[PDB]
């Protein structure tokens, strides 16, 4: 009933596309145009980057996933590390990535 496209403005499209590819470990589901890439993460939950340098590096998106460890290690092997790891009392982690422009992509998990 609703498709949520979470957007991120980026500076250099190529650098951003490379980085998001590594992080997500998937290729864009499609390109609406030449400086725009959309990933379908799941049904009705999509992430897109677009070249709008005047807004780049200010975005914040959070994904709560089933397997945080997989997100972590998979991104590590493809060469991207987290900026910060917060472990709260219950052991629930939030880990934050910074894209090439400085936007924050966080990944959390359930207790």
Which CATH number fits the domain that encloses residue 98? 3.10.180.10
80 three-state secondary structure = coil
Distance CA 16, CA 67 (A): 24
In 57-104, which ranges are continuous DSSP H helix? 68-77
Its domain, for residue 40, covers: 1-111
Q: How far is CA 14 from the centre of its chain?
A: 15
Structural domain tally of the chain? 1
Q: What DSSP state is assigned to residue 35?
A: T
Q: C-alpha distances in angstroms, 66 versus 11, 71, 108, 110?
A: 31, 9, 9, 7
Tokens of 68: 């945080």
């Amino acid at each position: 009933s609703l498709n949520l496209f979470a957007g991120v403005a980026v500076g250099d499209f190529g650098a951003a596309l490379a980085w998001y590819r590594s992080l997500l470990g998937a290729e864009p589901t499609f390109y609406p145009h030449e400086t725009e890439a959309v990933w379908q993460l799941e049904e009705g939950r999509l992430l897109y980057i677009v070249e709008r340098p005047e807004h780049a590096g200010h975005a914040m998106q959070t994904l709560i996933v089933e397997d945080l460890d997989a997100v972590l290690s998979g991104a590590s092997e493809r060469g991207v590390e987290a900026a910060k790891q917060e472990t709260y009392a219950n052991g629930v982690r939030k880990v934050t990535y910074l894209d090439p422009d400085g936007s924050e992509i966080a990944f959390g998990e359930v207790p």
